Structure formats: structure tokens, C-alpha cells
């Protein structure tokens, strides 16, 4: 009965991205980042900004007809921090609070597997 998108929450420091696409990932439904909701240019990563971004994400997903999302939560990864910023749990909580059902939370940050440091 549910229609499933995916969440693609990329929560670095300095910013968060709440970007629902379809089940493939080819077609996007309301990418809104954290720094476009309220910008003091340093509160972009804040839980308030992630809650605002996930809330109007869930507005447009209920508009299009998506009832549930599979959550893919990633950090900046690479040769860098690998820990999700303060916005990841806030964006997930606001997506669940704003009507969308949550399924399949998974951690898809890019572990660099022998990287390019030195």
C-alpha cells in the first residue's frame, strides 16, 4: 500500500542534504539542503535547519504521492570524518514526524578502502 522513495540524507559538518529520490535514484523529488532553509551561513548543519529541510521534503513527498522512504544516511566519508553531522538524526526524525513511514536505515558513507592520503 506504501509507495517508497529513498531519503539520501547526506549530513556533513557545515551542511545537511535531505534529498528524496525514487527507488532507482535517477529521478529526484525535492532536494532541499540545510543552508537554504535558514542561513546564518553557520547554522546550516544545525538540527533546526535539518528539521526544516526534512519537513518541506516530506511536504513535497506527500504532494507527489510517496508514503514511505528507505533511509540512506551518509557522512562526508572519503579521506575524512566518516561521522554524520548533527543534522542526520534531526532530518531522520523530522521525516518520520512529518507523516512519512521510515524503512531500511543504512549507512552508506564512502569508506575509502586504501585511500590517497600520502
Amino acid at each position: 500500500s506504501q509507495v517508497f522513495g529513498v531519503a539520501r540524507i547526506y549530513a556533513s559538518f557545515n551542511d545537511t542534504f535531505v534529498h528524496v529520490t525514487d527507488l532507482s535514484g535517477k529521478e529526484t523529488i525535492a532536494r532541499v539542503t540545510g543552508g537554504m532553509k535558514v542561513k546564518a551561513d553557520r547554522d546550516e548543519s544545525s538540527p533546526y535547519a535539518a528539521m526544516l529541510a526534512a519537513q518541506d521534503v516530506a511536504a513535497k513527498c506527500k504532494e507527489v504521492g510517496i508514503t514511505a522512504v528507505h533511509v540512506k544516511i551518509r557522512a562526508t566519508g572519503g579521506t575524512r570524518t566518516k561521522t554524520p553531522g548533527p543534522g542526520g538524526q534531526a532530518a531522520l526524525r523530522a521525516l518520520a514526524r512529518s507523516g512519512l513511514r521510515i524503512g531500511r536505515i543504512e549507512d552508506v558513507t564512502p569508506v575509502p578502502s586504501d585511500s590517497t592520503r600520502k
Binding site: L23, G25, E63
Partner: protein, 230 residues
């Protein structure tokens, strides 16, 4: 400068749903957007390249496949249905991070094998050295010649499990994790080896299309539809 005015792009979007191949259980996996089928980029060829990443638990009803996501590649569109075929397999990262422990060795192998079709697959394997029950030393390392011999028999018997399978036969073989049981039985002569897994299957080349083979993987179908009433 001047940027753009918006015109709502969800009025030109069309909903298809994805029918999985019949080497699985319940095969309606979800839906997919595409732009509306106009001339000059019809929607049925705006599709046909998309892979979707589904969970094998969602494809098989159970929860012991809660890891092991798979990829399904859209091949043929008919009647607002996307018929898919197998495109790959991958663990989640948390599964193999949950498997790796210090004071053991991980033997990992991979082989590039061409099946009984002309699909060529890079297929991987991981295995971790167990300790026996009554073992009192804390290490249980393999002596690296046991690693070379274990990796040798892993490569030989899983390249025997491919070439002796098609894609549908290999997929139905690696759903109930039984190539892992073949590796375990063939390798307990050398080292104990807890939790052998396949962990990753990549398509490299795919032969041709063969709509008949895809529709025999799914089921038949042909339409004479409605007629205009004037």
C-alpha cells in the same frame, strides 16, 4: 542576473512499477518516475538503463536476508511494467564490519567467470578463520599457505558453481546461501572458517538482449487493447 520561473515538473511525470524476475518471491518491488512519453525521447527508452537497489529481505519476505542488497536492471517495458533482470549483489557495509574481528584472518577471493550465457561476472568471496571448540590459544591464525590453499579451493569451486549455471540458475543458487555451504564443506579439511559469504557479484559484460529469454524468466504477455469508439 535573471534566473527562471517555475512550471511544476510533476505534471509531466509518469509512474511505472518494477516487476522483478521470477527467481525470487514477491515481485512487485515499487514504482518509478519518468518523464511523460513524448516524441523525441519516449519514456520506454528514457528507461531501460536504470538499475534499482532493493533489499533481498524485501524481495524474499524473510529477515535473514536483511543485509545483501541486490541490483535489478530494467530491460523491457511493456504496459506500464518494468521487467527487470539480475544486475549484481552487494552486502551492506555494516555486515562485513560486523564480521571483521581481530585475532583471526580474513581470506578473501574473487574470480572473473563467464557463465553458460555470455554474461561475465566478477564474483567475490570472504571467509574468516574460526577457532575450534577446546582451542585455548587466543589467536587462530592461518599460516598463509593455508590461506593460499583455501583461496585456491574457493576460486576453483566457485568457478565450478558458475559455468554450470545461467544467471537465473546462479541467482536461485545464491539466494539460499548454499555456495557458502559448498565452500565450508570443501574447506573444513584445511581450516575451520566461520561465516563464509559471497558478499559481492558484479556484471561486467552482458551478451545481447533476447526478449524471449527475459519473457521466459518472467511470464508471457501480448495485448490487443481497446479501440476508439467512433
Amino acid at each position: 542576473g535573471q534566473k527562471k520561473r517555475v512550471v511544476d515538473p510533476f505534471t509531466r511525470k509518469e509512474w511505472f512499477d518494477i516487476k522483478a524476475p521470477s527467481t525470487f518471491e514477491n515481485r512487485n518491488v515499487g514504482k518509478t518516475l519518468v518523464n511523460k512519453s513524448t516524441g523525441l525521447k519516449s519514456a520506454s527508452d528514457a528507461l531501460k538503463g536504470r538499475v534499482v537497489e532493493v533489499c533481498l529481505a524485501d524481495l524474499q519476505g524473510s529477515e535473514d536476508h536483511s543485509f545483501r542488497k541486490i541490483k535489478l536492471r530494467v530491460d523491457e517495458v511493456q504496459g506500464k511494467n518494468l521487467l527487470t533482470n539480475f544486475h549484481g549483489m552487494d552486502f551492506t557495509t555494516d555486515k562485513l564490519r560486523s564480521m571483521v574481528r581481530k585475532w583471526q584472518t580474513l581470506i578473501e577471493a574473487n574470480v572473473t567467470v563467464k557463465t553458460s550465457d555470455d554474461y561475465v561476472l566478477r564474483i567475490f568471496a570472504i571467509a574468516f578463520t574460526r577457532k575450534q571448540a577446546n582451542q585455548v590459544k587466543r589467536h587462530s591464525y592461518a599460516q598463509s599457505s593455508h590461506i593460499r590453499a583455501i583461496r585456491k579451493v574457493i576460486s576453483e569451486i566457485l568457478t565450478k558453481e558458475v559455468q554450470g549455471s545461467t544467471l537465473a540458475q546462479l541467482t536461485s543458487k545464491l539466494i539460499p546461501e548454499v555456495i557458502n555451504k559448498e565452500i565450508e564443506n570443501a574447506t573444513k579439511d584445511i581450516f575451520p572458517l566461520q561465516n563464509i559469504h559471497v558478499r559481492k557479484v558484479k556484471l561486467l559484460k552482458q551478451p545481447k538482449f533476447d526478449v524471449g529469454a527475459l519473457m521466459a524468466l518472467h511470464g508471457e504477455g501480448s495485448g490487443e487493447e481497446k479501440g476508439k469508439k467512433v
